[PDB]
Design a protein around this nucleic acid. Sequence first.
RNA 1: UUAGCUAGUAGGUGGGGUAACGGCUCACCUAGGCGACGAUCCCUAGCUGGUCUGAGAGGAUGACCAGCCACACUGGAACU
RNA 2: UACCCGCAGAAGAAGCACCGGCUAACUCCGGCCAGCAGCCCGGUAAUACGGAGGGUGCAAGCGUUAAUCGGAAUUACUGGGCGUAAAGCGCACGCAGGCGGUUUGUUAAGUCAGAUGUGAAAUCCCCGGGCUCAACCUGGGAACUGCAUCUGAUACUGG
Lengths: 80, 122, 205, 155, 129, 82
Amino acid sequence: KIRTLQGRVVSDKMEKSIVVAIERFVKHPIYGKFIKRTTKLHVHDENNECGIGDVVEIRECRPLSKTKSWTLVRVVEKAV
Amino acid sequence: ATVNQLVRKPRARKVAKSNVPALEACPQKRGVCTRVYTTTPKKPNSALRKVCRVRLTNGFEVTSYIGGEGHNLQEHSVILIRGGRVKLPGVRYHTVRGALDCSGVKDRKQARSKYGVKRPKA
Amino acid sequence: ARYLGPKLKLSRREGTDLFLKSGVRAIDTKCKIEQAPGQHGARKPRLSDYGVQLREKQKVRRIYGVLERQFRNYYKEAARLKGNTGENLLALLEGRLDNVVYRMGFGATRAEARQLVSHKAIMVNGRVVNIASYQVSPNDVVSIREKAKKQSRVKAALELAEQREKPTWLEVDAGKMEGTFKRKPERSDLSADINEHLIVELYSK
Amino acid sequence: ELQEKLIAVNRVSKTVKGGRIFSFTALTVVGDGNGRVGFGYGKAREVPAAIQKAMEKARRNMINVALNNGTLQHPVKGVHTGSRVFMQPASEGTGIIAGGAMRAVLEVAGVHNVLAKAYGSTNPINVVRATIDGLENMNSPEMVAAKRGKSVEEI
Amino acid sequence: SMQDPIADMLTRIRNGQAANKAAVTMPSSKLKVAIANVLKEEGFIEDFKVEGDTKPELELTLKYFQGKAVVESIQRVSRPGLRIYKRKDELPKVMAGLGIAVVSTSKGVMTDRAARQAGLGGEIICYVA
Amino acid sequence: MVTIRLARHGAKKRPFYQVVVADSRNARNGRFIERVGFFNPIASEKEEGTRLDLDRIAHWVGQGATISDRVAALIKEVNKAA
RNA sequence: UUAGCUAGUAGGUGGGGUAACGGCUCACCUAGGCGACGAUCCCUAGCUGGUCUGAGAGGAUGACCAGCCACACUGGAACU
RNA sequence: UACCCGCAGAAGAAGCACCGGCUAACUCCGGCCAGCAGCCCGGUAAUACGGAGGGUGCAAGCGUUAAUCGGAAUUACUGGGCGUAAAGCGCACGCAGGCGGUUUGUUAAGUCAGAUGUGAAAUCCCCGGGCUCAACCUGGGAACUGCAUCUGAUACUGG
């Protein structure tokens, strides 16, 4: 019921944090073609639960560091 | 071009280069007459065109035409130039007659405002 | 902001009577109407398309005595209004105050009608209106002021108008020197020798 | 009682041993004003003879146009060698918004309201040929209705 | 390779109409059958039949009126390289309403006026004039 | 504080005031929160020159918004006439 | 005709700090982070509602009016 | 002050550009010179130079210059091309990227529908109102083609 996002984890080398890439399908404003656009977010991953490739559901929260403002909700698909 | 080729590199609007770059988007520019001389036309035509070289206030040094019949213009004369080329290759500006050093063409009765001639009072 | 020079020159150039004179004579007895003005008036050169459009626009303008800025604004408003642009333009031209005063019979010419209006001698709904371009609306009542009813200009104009045709949208009483603007004239009520589409094409190019 | 209109007069020349031989070509268009229009093209060593030949060729070779209350049925595109032409039906009161040759064709054809535009080369001969080809390929609701084997409820 | 079979069906129809072919055959598909249904109910083709089980073959019977082509123009609008979707208030009308525009709305493949009456938009499959 | 006042629009010598609810620090014709009416001081008495909503005005006054003296007189005259 | 950039740099624990979250700051640890969807570097530039033009899509533009931002001789700093 | 009233007398008030074609407007007079020219005249009867007469267009303005868009479909998304006019890499393999045969099920990301919130006022547009008309001011509406959220649809694209 809370507004959230969904993307795949592209990096988990940092501790308690992951980098999730939110891919979106946007129509080109001029030529009308539907192009892919990637939004990479630094997400807070406590317990280090997410590996590379997991399709995770994230939500926005207060700033947790210089670049982290999103936190993890749950993992949908797990790197396989 | 394919829509994808345009997505990757859009259309590049052709940029138009000015024909009077020494004015710098100004209608008129002031300058001092460096050298007053005459020039011969090009091919078909045959005359002795009255022209002058003028260093403008922005540092540009350009050759400017002196329209009308007869002119009293010497070196160090501070005139006002405007756009408008002479078809005399190289000359791309005209001297405003009646502008602070260039007296109007004497004995003008028609198209006086184009040559800075006061209206002859009856 | 006014044309003060020769009047019959305009009608000679347009090749058509523009009613620039009162009507004590025929224009044929005052000028060579069938000959264009000037030294080279005997010649008639083949007019271009732009020539015909310009000449029709100038004929309408010189008929109504309207300069170019006001006529351009008239065309702009007519193209803005809904319907056909040409009849809108002619209705906007006929709605003017000096035009109505002339058509009402208080002016021998539209120039003297404009002089009557401008000199504060014409009332609209009891209010003295001295604007020649004043748009007269339906049901408006136009009358000569008490002070100007004594002028022989209005008498001669009344007589000269009685010898003219009567417009269908004007209910005028020559005794009270007053009239009523009943409605805007339809396209079929004005002159049939005026091609509005020429003006529309000239102003839409 | 059809209307005839001279669109363009052009002076062409052929060279011979003695020098240049100048002749004149005239492009005209005729039409009855309610859906029939035809263009003629005549070459002659003089201008009035060229115009006469053009008028005789234009009085024959006339096509039929399926008009719709004095305007087009639908937006049409006409194409000849270099000229590409676009015509579009307008509402009542707009007039003919078209170039010279297009104006002549659409005016003698009977079209009163149209928004037109000429692309490519504006050659008068090719422009009038493209306009005629676009107007004759324009079909009416009855034509498509009878060609589809269903009533004309699309109108 | 074959990356647009719907444009291939339209091209087969156009080429069979220009060559005065009596009928055109092609590999069948659900979308092809839906578009052929829309074309037949609008009166652009006579009939269509799907033959075969493991490799269905769709056969459209082309239509002529005066020895002339019934389908004057048929174009692919939405294509793999550029998809075109329209809302119900901006659905296109071909030939100022005399032609049809095959639209794929959430309630199946239908014409543009049927999608307008149904208050629907979707992918503009093709224009048939 | 939040105040309900007039913003002098119109032409020269023919003022037309818009009764606006605005933060009192902004400029006269500047940023405002909500327009709650108008006031034409040179009305011909043939037409209306006082169409200020009293519902939202009372709602804002209930929230501590201040009423300027001219707007207070306008509210008084609107209540008397209606 | 700028392809690599970054050491408080990215994150974590703890102390401090702020009205408030936060490398905002410090100690330590981990070795990361940004980048071909143009990072870095260079030139130009106040942003918007809007204005002009255009059938439209667009192109140009950001004076007046209104909103936001920045500046107050130049550089720095805090006090109330 | 606006506005109104009285006085006197046409009395205090018309200029600028252009006229070879494009482009509305033509004759006379003075040597490739003087000069004009936005793009295509003048070497001794120049509608193109300069003057005069006449005319044309605007008009308390008129022209020139500078600048933007249009015309320019002349950066072509709408809406262009590449044999010879400018344009197919000398040829191939191939990563990223773009696209992808056919059937079923599922999802509802793209797509579509509805609703809510927002999209400041002014400006643009429509119907009226007040300035003697207009400009201008102004009431109401439409518009702001956008974004987010929620609920559904499942034909097509995607997983």
